Amino acid sequence: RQYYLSKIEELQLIVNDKSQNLRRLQAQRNELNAKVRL
Amino acid sequence: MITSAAGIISLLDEDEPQLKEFALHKLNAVVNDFWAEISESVDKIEVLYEDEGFRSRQFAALVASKVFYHLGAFEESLNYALGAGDLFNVNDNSEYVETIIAKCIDHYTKQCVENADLPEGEKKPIDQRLEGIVNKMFQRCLDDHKYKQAIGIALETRRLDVFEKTILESNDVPGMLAYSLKLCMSLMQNKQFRNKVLRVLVKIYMNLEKPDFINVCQCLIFLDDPQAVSDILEKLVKEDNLLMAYQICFDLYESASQQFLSSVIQNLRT
Amino acid sequence: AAEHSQRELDTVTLEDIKEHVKQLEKAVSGKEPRFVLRALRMLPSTSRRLNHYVLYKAVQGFFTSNNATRDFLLPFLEEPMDTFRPAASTPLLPEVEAYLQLLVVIFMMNSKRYKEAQKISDDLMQKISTQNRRALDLVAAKCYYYHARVYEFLDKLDVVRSFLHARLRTATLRHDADGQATLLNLLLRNYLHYSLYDQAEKLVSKSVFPEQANNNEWARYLYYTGRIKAIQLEYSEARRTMTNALRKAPQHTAVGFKQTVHKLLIVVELLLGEIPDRLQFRQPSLKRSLMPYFLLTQAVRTGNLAKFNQVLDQFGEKFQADGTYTLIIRLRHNVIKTGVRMISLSYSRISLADIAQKLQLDSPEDAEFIVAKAIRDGVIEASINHEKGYVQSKEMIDIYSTREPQLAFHQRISFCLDIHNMSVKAMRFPPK
Amino acid sequence: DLYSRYKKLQQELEFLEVQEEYIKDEQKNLKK
Amino acid sequence: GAVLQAATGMYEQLKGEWNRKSPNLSKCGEELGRLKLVLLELNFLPLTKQQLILARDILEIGAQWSILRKDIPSFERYMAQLKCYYFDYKEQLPESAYMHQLLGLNLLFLLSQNRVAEFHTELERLPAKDIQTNVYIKHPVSLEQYLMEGSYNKVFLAKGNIPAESYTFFIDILLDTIRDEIAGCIEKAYEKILFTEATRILFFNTPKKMTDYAKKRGWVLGPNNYYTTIPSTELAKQVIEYARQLEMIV
Amino acid sequence: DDEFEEFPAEDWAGLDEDEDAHVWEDNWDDDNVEDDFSNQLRAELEKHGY
């Protein structure tokens, strides 16, 4: 029961962290792609 | 009142087993207060547990499991919690028992999937104590009436027997069946295990008092079993429920592939 | 006049409380951590005012769903006679209620009211032990910190050892960072307050301090482990850790913390044979406090035993008040080692009789034993020649062309590349 | 409920890993 | 219940034999063994005040027997349990007459086997007022300080200034410890020390004893009685690591 | 910012008068004792002829 909740919250924090990381990577790639396109 | 730990660890070095047993009881009394002094003296607990002549070797295993749970040695803490025997009271709501339960479940799931993908002859023997504590957790989940959680753990552990038990013993058989069907179709990537789950679902559906023949046919299409669908249609014809037959055939055409329909129409003719 | 200004101050403090509550609510929005430390950062500023009127207004303002958890603070809460929900009956977020209870805790802490303070802190941390949300982990750190602080002036710091141990573990499994560091520091302070240095050392060796910890918490941990290793004869690493602590301490505030760390650093450096720089003995905020340690240091530089004894006799109360008496005694017997370090720093080759004459050692063999003992440690790099009487020092090879600069500059790479990597990782672009 | 949320979290995490690896590869190629 | 009275009678007999000039070693040892056995049922550690007092007396007699037996490992465990019974959270036991005697006993023991860190921690445990006042702990602290300076001859002089006869046991082993530490510091200090000077200042009065101790260590006599490359591998790895941290994106 | 109240903020008594309150950053060597110069010189060479 509560083991489900512990796993869920751990995955939730991991997913939040990796989502911020992915957003940052997307911004970097977007700026580089904009430079290339220009 | 006590001042430090050195007294009890010093008692660990005595020769009389009863002194060691009393010291182990004292250690299990206060291990959440101060574990560090026992961490370096763990070897004493190890040799005490490894002595087959110790009547309370299970208490030594429990103490070492607690200490390693402090240390984070969760593999070794799991090993010595399994070695703790029945003294590991699952029903207790302590933090230690709870996190060791979580580690037990994770280890069981890992070993279970590793055995499942492997063929029959290469299955590494799962520890009986780990399987037993997992079964105890399954029973506790069943008693607490949280049937969905037990279903999910059973799916994780590839244990179709517990999955069937949870589905049948649940108060709402059709609702749990629908929930399991949605889960299996939308979440499971293991094709062979999804097929096993679908076969279990089909068997439960047929053994239901009023079979959900529509869902049976859907699951059979997913399993690619035109023979079973043809036999179901023949039985429906014999049993006069023609509206089931017609709706089933229409769903079959709307969903099943051309080869599936050809096989069904062939078995229907013969 | 005074009433008007008091009312305006109370209103603006209430507005800051509203803003902090809104920030805590926003922190859960987006399902991300942080944005709570923004409210918790101005915690000393809000704590400074904490009038009864503003506390009562906040209690009545954010608790439209009346429960018993507030009905305990109300008996101690005093409302204005002649003298606002910011607004439906939406249930309170756990972080918000924990926050308001924490400011209640701080107010009751400030007014010397301790027993009911113990009660309210107990009811505060009883609930948070049930939650499993990371948003309530940052607040839990301050909750534990002021809980221990409340038990401190209540002179019951020994009682809470079990509770802090349990919460420290709980944080360890949940991979908490701020709560873990705060709990570890509180545990170290608890161990030190009863001189359980061995227990603290054992705890330190088995517990890893989180790297992402706050600056203040890192400084506190460094000071505590430095005191450990200093009273545990590991003088060199203790001094290194104490200096590192002074680097990370706040610059403007933390006068008492810096005073204590400077006192211990002085004693440790003197024990190591080095001489603390006179600059620290000159800052105003540090001068008078270090004045007893100043008269001491001079004696160590001179080796004047009578001056050392007089300083001890006239300042033992102050030395014990900060728990440096024992280390000062060890220094009283390491003054000779300090003198030998100076002698070997100045001279290259020197006869042992000269050592004895300069250090007032009254024996050449005694000087030989003392210099041999000192050179056994890393105190002095030399090579005694008993056949003649030399204390010949080691030849100073060119540090360049010796792979030593390569090692140091490699460490500095590792650091700078690491800094660049964390900087580029923490950019955190927003969604909109 | 709980298991469904947990499985959704795992699937989302795996997809995030896929996107991260994709973006790193594309970053290398875009630098070229 | 009556078990504590039975233990009281038996350890009264034990101490009656103990105060005799030469108590029977095996008899008192077995008496203490079964005594702590019944002490276990008598709530060994966590309470009746007399209960704690009698347990403290049992452990004190046990430690003093342990030193009297002339055995080290048991002594550690007896004083460890006694520390568990000594001075923290107790606040109810009357100030024992043997408090400081065994406190200094433990301190000198810690000095004996090169446990200076533990020695100073236990110094921190006990109150500061007795450190320079009580002779029983003034002594071991004094030898520790003399060892810290390096005034070994002072330690040899003060070896006869023990505050009680129940100190010589590891006074001897500490006299050996200071000599072996002297030898270690000598080998890490000098370049090539002559045999006769070592014999003089190692306090090995018998030259044969000094030679035997020389054979005891890898530090050997010698003939006349007178006792780089560019690695390019790991630092190449370091440079490649820098190259990695430049590349491979964030 | 933490004020570190756990460590008592050691009050500088009553901000009593200091030594100099000067602006005079000094070193460790300014506190010793000395006896002029010429005295030394004559006192150490008249033994050899001054």
Swiss-Prot record, chain A:
Q: Which gene encodes it?
A: PSMC5
> Whole protein: which stretch is covered?
21 to 58 of 406
Q: Which family does it belong to?
A: Belongs to the AAA ATPase family.
| UniProt-recorded name of the protein | 26S proteasome regulatory subunit 8
Top-level taxon: Eukaryota
Describe its partners and assembly state. Component of the 19S proteasome regulatory particle complex. The 26S proteasome consists of a 20S core particle (CP) and two 19S regulatory subunits (RP). The regulatory particle is made of a lid composed of 9 subunits, a base containing 6 ATPases including PSMC5 and few additional components. Component of a complex with USP49 and RUVBL1. Interacts with PRPF19. Interacts with TRIM5. Interacts with NDC80. Interacts with PAAF1. Interacts, in vitro, with the thyroid hormone receptor (in a thyroid hormone T3-dependent manner) and with retinoid X receptor (RXR). Interacts with ERCC6.
Q: Where in the cell is it found?
A: Cytoplasm; Nucleus
Q: What does this protein do?
A: Component of the 26S proteasome, a multiprotein complex involved in the ATP-dependent degradation of ubiquitinated proteins. This complex plays a key role in the maintenance of protein homeostasis by removing misfolded or damaged proteins, which could impair cellular functions, and by removing proteins whose functions are no longer required. Therefore, the proteasome participates in numerous cellular processes, including cell cycle progression, apoptosis, or DNA damage repair.
Swiss-Prot record, chain D:
Coiled-coil positions are none
State the compartments where it is located.
Answer: Cytoplasm; Nucleus
Subunit notes for this chain? Component of the 19S proteasome regulatory particle complex. The 26S proteasome consists of a 20S core particle (CP) and two 19S regulatory subunits (RP). The regulatory particle is made of a lid composed of 9 subunits, a base containing 6 ATPases including PSMC4 and few additional components. Interacts with NR1I3. Interacts with PAAF1. Interacts with TRIM5. Interacts with ZFAND1.
Please describe what this protein does: Component of the 26S proteasome, a multiprotein complex involved in the ATP-dependent degradation of ubiquitinated proteins. This complex plays a key role in the maintenance of protein homeostasis by removing misfolded or damaged proteins, which could impair cellular functions, and by removing proteins whose functions are no longer required. Therefore, the proteasome participates in numerous cellular processes, including cell cycle progression, apoptosis, or DNA damage repair.
Which family does the similarity line name? Belongs to the AAA ATPase family.
Would you tell me the protein name for this molecule? 26S proteasome regulatory subunit 6B
Q: What is the lineage of its organism?
A: Eukaryota, Metazoa, Chordata, Craniata, Vertebrata
From Swiss-Prot, chain E:
The organism's lineage is: Eukaryota, Metazoa, Chordata, Craniata, Vertebrata
Instruction: Give the family per the record.
Output: Belongs to the proteasome subunit S14 family.
Q: What is this protein called?
A: 26S proteasome non-ATPase regulatory subunit 8
- UniProt GO BP: proteasome-mediated ubiquitin-dependent protein catabolic process
Entry keyword set: Isopeptide bond, Phosphoprotein, Proteasome, Ubl conjugation
Give the species: Homo sapiens (Human)
Q: What region holds the PCI domain? A: 73-231
Q: Where is this cross-link: Glycyl lysine isopeptide (Lys-Gly) (interchain with G-Cter in SUMO2)?
A: K208
Which cellular component terms (GO) are annotated to the entry?
Answer: cytosol; nucleoplasm; nucleus; proteasome accessory complex; proteasome complex; proteasome regulatory particle; proteasome regulatory particle, lid subcomplex
Q: Which residues of the full protein are shown?
A: 85 to 350 of 350
Q: Which gene encodes it?
A: PSMD8
Protein purpose: Component of the 26S proteasome, a multiprotein complex involved in the ATP-dependent degradation of ubiquitinated proteins. This complex plays a key role in the maintenance of protein homeostasis by removing misfolded or damaged proteins, which could impair cellular functions, and by removing proteins whose functions are no longer required. Therefore, the proteasome participates in numerous cellular processes, including cell cycle progression, apoptosis, or DNA damage repair.
From Swiss-Prot, chain F:
Subcellular location, principal: nucleus
UniProt GO cellular component terms: cytosol; integrator complex; nucleoplasm; proteasome complex; proteasome regulatory particle, lid subcomplex; protein-containing complex
Which keywords fit this entry according to its UniProt record?
A: Nucleus, Proteasome
Q: In which tissues is it expressed?
A: Expressed in limb bud, craniofacial primordia and skin.
Q: What is this protein called?
A: 26S proteasome complex subunit SEM1
Regions that span the bilayer:
none
Describe its function.
Answer: Component of the 26S proteasome, a multiprotein complex involved in the ATP-dependent degradation of ubiquitinated proteins. This complex plays a key role in the maintenance of protein homeostasis by removing misfolded or damaged proteins, which could impair cellular functions, and by removing proteins whose functions are no longer required. Therefore, the proteasome participates in numerous cellular processes, including cell cycle progression, apoptosis, or DNA damage repair.
Q: What family does the entry list?
A: Belongs to the DSS1/SEM1 family.
Q: Report which gene this protein is encoded by.
A: SEM1
GO annotation (BP), single: double-strand break repair via homologous recombination
